Design a protein around this ligand. Structure first.
Ligand SMILES: [Mg+2]
Ligand SMILES: [Mg+2]
Ligand SMILES: [Mg+2]
Ligand SMILES: [Mg+2]
Ligand SMILES: [Zn+2]
Lengths: 166, 289, 246, 133, 153, 110, 295, 148
């Protein structure tokens, strides 16, 4: 096994020279060897990306997936870690930087079939990773306006060259 | 397990490579690296440029204020006695001033002689450009001046490098005549003007006005913008060719997306013909008189 | 098809193997401070007066029976011992220990400070950055009292010396992201600390160490934090109604 | 911004709901009975009948079916179609639509205001009818 | 094709459905408030409304009695229907029942849940949804319109 | 019928990261004016409904103590009371449940 | 005094910044005040805050984003506080919402804010050649079908009343104002340095004089958003973004003996309360009628 | 392969050979073993050739390090900043000489595919074709069906 994500919270930065912009907090946290599947977990973890932490808690609160409550618990833990251990005012000020599902170590079992054949079955486990960053949520990108597409096209026609030409 | 040193060692090399790929090390002076002899370096500089310097004057030329103040930090923090031998160092300030003054004079003369029709504002703009931060730093760093320069903060911020380059010029001006140094300048500076435009380095914002003034000076009257060629007006990509006429003769002409853009172009073209900064123009002379 | 996981870690305190220890735990120090000197309540207004403070301090030192009984036990067990030299050494121990917290060097910090002190001064601060400087000592370090604990089991004696000291210090604590947390680096702030020292006597290697730090009940409220802090009300289950005291 | 979903009813008190309903229904009565007199308003010029001509249609409502008899004795079955509120809504000229025949847009029975869209409600607002299904 | 089918299929068949609603009804008449599968509660609500109208028909009506006999399973309840429930609904024609959606069941089957109730029961009141007050900004803007529908009449 | 070739990871990402298989964001969530927890707008508040549920259970327990057996249910209406209360003239002639707790804030006297 | 339109803006903003930095300098340290929470929701909660720095908005942030978005006004003790107005002493706090049971306080605030917005929209919507004097924002009850702002205009402009085009332009500009989200900022000032801000508007100086007259310490209440500053009675809503539906309904010329004053009426609703298209049209129709309460 | 690797246009460093020619190779560092056989050629080269090489090229500084290594290398280093590594391991004197020459005459630019064999600033003297260059102009400059 490999446990890295945990140690990401043990990093110490050099103090900030005055006049430099204030560095936003980062909190890495995870839960290992959950009895959920990795994929079913992925949908959930995907849902809450880039949401402000309260928004994610609200969304998870009402989902019916078994994983919803796991993730929620991990988020509360991470929030309290962020205010207690790292120094963060305004526990509402976190947004979800990274949310993802890794695969755990699987158990292996028999699945009985008929005519004495068998399949080989896997009791599945998974990991849930999260990384919380201090600040408002970064703005969701608007699709390209007609103006943007037109500029790009024009710029392209203008990048043309006489080819194999000299 | 597999028994051998070889693959293990060879892999140690891969490990080091990845280590350097994920965290690049901050750039280090060539002087603090394994093979260095400052003296031999200096001599080689001179020989490779095909010039002859006084080694005292060059060694002087690569010295800077900052190197001396940092050396005084190391002097004062350890309680050492330096002052006589350290303040004997004779920095490059003087040399750099002679260098820049002479180079600006030289250049100005070169252009003034080559482009008789360039307005003084123009030739000024040109000398300004070839003496710029960008150009001089590029050339200096490619001649291994950054290598030899004595300075704090290894990337050697651009003002220090301009200082040091022209320091070397001045050192050359003492070491050899203004003739020799004029040749060096026309070889390592003027060549950066290759491929470049006029209005690439001049930056003037109203071509039409400037054209009208220059034509007052030439005793020609009223450039009239007259539309020559066009394709599609209703398109999202039109092309206009605007001509400029003086007494119904055509002086110059240009393309554009919009009739305004194109008119402005025809102005720039006309300007470029008048001033004799042109594509067809005689390429520069590199020769030994 | 049959394999299971292993490694569910647990901590089980159980008195039986704890008793069966064949080499009983050897302590360099004792966790408590036997007798805590409780200082004058006007000790702020007698500090600006030199020969008031000095007089009453030296007086209370010479006048006390317990004080000179313990000083006699230390002098008789440990020759070439002097009380008039000691606040110098103590003040030096201080300055080195805290300059150890700056650099975060724990090895030297285990020679200087005691086993009871180390958890305290190191623990919370290990993921942060500390910058601590010594600028002035306003009133030269005073020796308030001396005490001895006689363990009849070991025949072991621990000399405990309380040095009251008044100081000028600059403390800045930075957060693990390098952003300032506690206090400025430019303010030479004035402190008053009652610093307990300890030494093992029967021990041949006989280190003088910094045992503990006593804060008086009237001590000036420490400078305020930078960040805002919230204190939640009692967490309520559904059927439990809230009750407000006045 | 996470702006929440909302319907017409949501923020009204128990007091104001009957009020709003009255408001809407009453203005529906007014509006329908106002356009009740077509010929005295500004009728578009009436033309006589040309041979290849074609009339406007209707939007009706299927009621049910009924038997009906003919004088020869035979039985028929018929469908009742009730016309409820039927108005011509807009007019697209001949050259703007098929290049052959003009287009009249006819509305069907009245529906609630609250469950249509801003666009459509604007279209009827400038007309002065209530929304058609 | 399901067109105009009023009753939903539950249980092991039509009969099993009736017996399901039997138990639910009995439960409702005894405890006066129960919670079940939103669909089953919805299905029940009709019968729970009509039972009260058979109770209104009186003890002496035979039809109402063998009706309440079949539907109320624990026979002890049959008096309570006639002598408690049916009397306390007199004025109101249809208003007997309140049915609300509860949050989804906390068990892993995560069902859709409803609470169903006989009005005027003696229990802590459900946290019903309240309409907005009249003091609310938008409603205050409507009150203006109202008072000008009075002033212009 | 057996798959003729392994499906590539690109294809499979296309299938399962499709918008239609993604969890869709619920926009009807709000706060309960009472306890300040979360609820969907068309559904009762879970928390408040839990208070009510507990109290209901207690009342039913104590009205199970008044009934000596399974089949005895009163032929009269009932009323529930709390510490420091007495049956009104309108409320007398009814089954009385007496509870120890003080009458809850949400629960009115009626 | 010879001054451009932009110079007035510059002077006023620089004065405001001077004053704000003076109030900042008045507080030497980071002082800790203990706020308590009297709200129906999370009782016993205690915030430990920075005196004259921390605001009731910065207070909500310790709870959850939910307060942050839902809370328009902050009741401190018995008084309404603007969400960004820094807390002075230790106290108790309750938060106030649009869908709350006795919203009246909030309603008032909302109305005021909208009025002020319109004011801005008006002052900058006229040609430099003319002279636009904002008068005041008369405080109407909200049962009155609109909110309004009093404005006097250049004498040569006295003959025209606007066209639906112009009104719709005002509206477009107000919506332009909403789109970019500007916090409403508050400052408490002494009349001496208050009058120096406004100057050229006479009516403003009169208003300031009365407003300061009824208060013992000569305190005037200033609000500002973006580059626009105005004096007003009572607190305002925290953000510009709070408004969703907004209209400048119609104007009405009303004349004293000594002045000719135009009254601009407009109507708006917050995102929280937003009303259906039909409902909106009816309210909009009532908002066209003259609304008179000055007393 | 060409789609596989990077590429560059044909260039000179600092317009070399325009004004004057500057030998681009700056310094040369040898590392060899006095003892080990692998370095044999490299030793002979250092004996006979290096000296003469150093006279033939005044502008390059040559650092020779005897050290205990198994694999003799030569590190060429250029004005360009470019550093090119080579192994003289187990070669003749002749081979090494040829190699050191290649190093001497290289530009220090990266060796990759070169997109085209020529490089011109201002290829275009006397014009550059555009759709109108060969078209005749008409009277009034009217379009095809335009009337006046
Ligand atoms: Mg078998
Ligand atoms: Mg398989
Ligand atoms: Mg498998
Ligand atoms: Mg079934
Ligand atoms: Zn609730």
């Amino acid at each position: 096994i490999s446990r890295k994500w945990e140690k990401k919270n043990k990093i110490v930065y050099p103090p900030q020279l005055p006049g430099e912009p204030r560095r936003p907090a980062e909190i890495y946290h995870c839960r290992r060897q959950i009895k959920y599947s990795k994929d079913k977990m992925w949908y959930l973890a995907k849902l809450i990306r880039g949401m402000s932490i309260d928004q994610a808690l609200a969304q998870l609160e009402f989902s019916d997936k078994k994983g919803a409550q796991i993730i929620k618990e991990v988020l509360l833990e991470a929030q309290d870690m962020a205010v207690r251990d790292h120094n963060v005012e305004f526990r509402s000020n976190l947004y979800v930087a990274e949310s993802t599902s890794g695969r755990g170590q699987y158990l292996k079992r028999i699945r009985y079939h008929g005519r004495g054949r068998f399949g080989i079955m896997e009791k599945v486990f998974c990991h849930y990773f999260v990384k919380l960053v201090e600040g408002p949520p970064p703005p969701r990108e608007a699709p390209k306006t007609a103006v943007a597409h037109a500029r790009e096209y024009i710029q392209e026609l203008r990048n043309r060259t006489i080819t194999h030409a000299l | 397990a597999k028994k051998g040193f070889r693959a293990a060692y060879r892999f140690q090399k891969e490990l080091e490579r990845w280590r350097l790929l994920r965290c690049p090390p901050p750039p280090v002076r060539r002087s603090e690296k394994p093979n260095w002899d400052y003296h031999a370096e200096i001599q080689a500089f001179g020989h490779r440029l095909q010039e002859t310097f006084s080694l005292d004057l060059l060694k002087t030329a690569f010295v800077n204020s900052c190197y001396i103040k940092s050396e005084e930090a190391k002097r004062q923090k350890l309680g050492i006695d330096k002052e006589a031998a350290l303040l004997n160092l004779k920095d490059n300030q003087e040399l750099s001033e002679q260098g820049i003054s002479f180079s600006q004079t030289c250049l100005t003369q070169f252009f003034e002689d080559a482009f008789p029709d360039l307005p003084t504002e123009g030739v000024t703009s040109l000398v300004d450009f070839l003496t710029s931060e960008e150009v001089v730093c590029h050339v200096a760093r490619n001649l291994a001046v950054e290598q030899l320069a004595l300075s704090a903060e290894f990337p050697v911020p651009p003002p220090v490098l301009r200082q040091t380059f022209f320091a070397v010029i001045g050192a050359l001006l003492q070491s050899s005549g203004p003739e020799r140094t004029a040749l060096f300048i026309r070889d390592f500076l003027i060549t950066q003007m290759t491929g470049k435009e006029l209005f690439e380095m001049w930056t003037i914002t109203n071509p039409m006005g400037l054209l009208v003034e220059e034509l007052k000076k030439r005793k020609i009257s009223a450039p009239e913008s007259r539309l020559t060629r066009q394709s599609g007006s209703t398109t999202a990509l039109p092309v206009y060719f605007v001509g400029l006429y003086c007494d119904r003769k055509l002086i110059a002409e240009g393309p554009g997306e919009t009739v305004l853009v194109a008119e402005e172009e025809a102005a720039r073209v006309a300007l470029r013909k008048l001033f004799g900064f042109t594509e067809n123009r005689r390429p520069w002379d590199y020769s030994k008189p | 098809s049959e394999k299971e996981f292993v490694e569910h870690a647990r901590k089980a305190g159980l008195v039986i193997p704890h008793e069966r220890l064949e080499r009983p735990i050897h302590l360099a120090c004792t966790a408590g401070i036997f007798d805590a000197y409780v200082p004058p309540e006007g000790d702020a207004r007698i500090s600006s007066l030199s020969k008031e403070g000095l007089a009453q301090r030296a007086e209370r030192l010479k006048k006390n029976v317990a004080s000179q009984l313990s000083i006699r036990k230390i002098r008789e067990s440990d020759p070439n011992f002097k009380i008039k030299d000691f606040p110098e050494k103590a003040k030096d121990i201080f300055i080195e220990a805290h300059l150890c917290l700056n650099n975060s060097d724990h090895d030297r910090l285990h020679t200087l400070v005691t086993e009871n002190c180390f958890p305290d001064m190191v623990w919370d601060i290990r993921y942060k950055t500390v910058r601590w400087s010594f600028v002035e000592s306003l009133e030269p370090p005073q020796v308030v009292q001396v005490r001895c604990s006689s363990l009849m089991n070991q025949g072991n004696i621990y000399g405990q010396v309380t040095v009251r000291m008044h100081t000028r210090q600059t403390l800045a604590i930075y957060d693990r992201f390098g952003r300032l947390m506690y206090g400025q680096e430019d303010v030479p702030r004035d402190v008053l600390e009652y610093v307990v020292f300890e030494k093992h006597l029967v021990d041949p290697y006989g280190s003088w160490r910094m045992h503990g730090k006593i804060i008086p009940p009237w001590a000036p409220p420490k400078q305020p934090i930078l960040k805002t802090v919230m204190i939640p009300g009692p967490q309520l289950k559904p059927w439990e109604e809230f009750e407000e005291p006045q | 911004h996470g702006k929440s979903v909302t319907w017409w009813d949501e923020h009204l008190s128990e007091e104001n709901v009957p009020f709003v309903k009255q408001l809407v229904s009453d203005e529906n009565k007014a509006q329908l009975a106002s356009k009740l007199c077509p010929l005295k308003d500004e009728p578009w010029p009436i033309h006589p009948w040309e041979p290849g001509s074609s009339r406007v249609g209707l939007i009706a409502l299927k009621l049910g079916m009924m038997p009906l008899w003919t004088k020869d004795g035979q039985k028929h079955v018929v469908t009742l179609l009730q016309v409820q509120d039927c108005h011509v809504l807009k007019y697209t000229p001949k050259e703007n639509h098929n290049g052959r025949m003009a287009a009249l847009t006819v509305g069907g029975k009245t529906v609630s205001h609250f469950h249509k869209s801003a666009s459509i409600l604007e279209f009827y607002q400038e007309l002065g009818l209530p929304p058609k299904q | 094709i399901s067109h105009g089918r009023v009753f939903r299929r539950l249980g092991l068949g039509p009969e099993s459905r009736i017996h399901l609603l039997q138990n639910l009804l009995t439960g409702l008449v005894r405890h006066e408030r129960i919670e079940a599968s939103w669909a089953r509660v919805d299905e029940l609500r009709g019968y729970a409304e009509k039972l009260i109208d058979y109770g209104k028909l009186g003890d002496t009506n035979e039809r109402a009695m063998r009706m309440a006999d079949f539907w109320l399973t624990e026979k002890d309840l049959i008096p309570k229907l006639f002598q408690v429930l049916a009397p306390r609904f007199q004025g109101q024609n249809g208003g007997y029942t309140r049915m609300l959606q509860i949050p989804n069941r906390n068990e892993q089957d995560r069902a859709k849940m409803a609470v169903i109730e006989y009005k005027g029961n003696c229990l802590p009141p459900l946290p019903l949804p309240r309409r907005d007050s009249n003091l609310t900004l938008l409603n205050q803007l409507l009150q203006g319109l109202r008072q000008d529908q009075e002033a212009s009449s | 019928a057996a798959p003729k070739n392994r499906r590539s990871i690109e294809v499979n990402r296309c299938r399962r990261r499709n918008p239609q298989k993604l969890i869709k964001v619920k926009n009807n969530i709000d706060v309960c004016p009472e306890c300040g927890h979360l609820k969907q707008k068309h559904i009762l508040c879970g928390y408040c409904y839990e208070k009510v549920r507990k109290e209901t259970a207690e009342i039913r327990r104590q009205m199970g103590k008044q009934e000596g057996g399974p089949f005895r249910a009163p032929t009269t209406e009932t009323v529930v009371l709390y510490s420091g209360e007495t049956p009104s003239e309108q409320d007398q002639g009814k089954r009385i449940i007496e509870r120890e707790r003080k009458r809850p804030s949400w629960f009115t006297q009626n | 005094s010879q001054l451009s339109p932009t110079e007035l803006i510059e002077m006023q903003n620089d004065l405001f910044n001077k004053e704000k930095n003076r109030q900042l300098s008045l507080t030497p340290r980071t002082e800790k005040i203990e706020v308590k929470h009297v709200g129906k929701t999370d009782p016993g909660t205690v915030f430990v805050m920075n005196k004259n720095i921390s605001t009731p908005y910065s207070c909500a942030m310790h709870l959850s984003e939910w307060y942050c978005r839902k809370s328009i006004l902050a009741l401190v003790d018995g008084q309404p506080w603007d969400m960004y107005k820094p807390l002075t002493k230790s106290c108790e706090i309750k938060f106030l919402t649009f869908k709350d049971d006795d919203p009246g306080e909030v309603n008032k605030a909302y109305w005021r804010s909208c009025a002020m917005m319109m004011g801005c929209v008006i002052e900058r919507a006229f040609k430099d050649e003319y002279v636009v004097s904002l008068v005041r924002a008369p405080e109407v009850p909200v049962i009155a079908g609109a909110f309004c702002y009093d404005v006097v205009l250049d004498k040569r402009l006295d003959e025209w009343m606007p066209t639906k085009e112009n009104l719709h332009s005002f509206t477009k500009d107000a919506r332009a104002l909403i789109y970019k989200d500007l916090p409403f900022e508050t400052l408490e000032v002494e009349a001496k340095v208050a009058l120096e801000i406004f100057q050229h508007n006479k009516y403003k100086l009169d208003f300031i004089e009365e407003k300061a007259s009824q208060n013992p310490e000569r305190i005037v209440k200033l609000h500002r958003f973006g580059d626009f500053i105005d004096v007003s009675e009572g607190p305002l809503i925290p953000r510009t973004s709070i408004c969703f539906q907004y209209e400048v309904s119609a104007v009405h010329n009303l004349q004293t003996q000594s002045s000719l004053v135009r009254r601009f009426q407009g109507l708006s609703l917050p995102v929280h309360l937003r009303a259906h298209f039909t409902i909106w049209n009816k309210l909009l129709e009532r908002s066209r009628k003259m609304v008179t309460e000055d007393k | 392969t060409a789609r596989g690797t990077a590429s560059r246009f044909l260039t000179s460093v600092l317009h070399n050979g325009l004004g004057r020619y500057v030998q681009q190779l700056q310094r040369l560092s040898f590392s060899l073993s006095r003892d080990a056989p692998s370095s044999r050629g490299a030793r002979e080269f250092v004996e006979r050739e290096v000296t003469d090489f150093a006279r033939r090229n005044p502008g390059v500084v040559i650092y020779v390090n005897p050290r205990p290594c198994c694999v003799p290398r030569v590190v060429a280093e250029y004005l360009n900043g470019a550093v090119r590594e080579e192994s003289i391991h187990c070669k003749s004197v002749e081979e090494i000489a040829a190699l050191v020459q290649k190093l001497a005459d290289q530009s220090g630019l990266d060796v990759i595919r070169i997109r085209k064999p020529f490089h011109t600033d201002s290829p275009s003297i006397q014009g550059q074709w555009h759709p109108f260059t060969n078209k005749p102009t008409t009277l009034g400059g009217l379009r095809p069906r335009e009337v006046q």
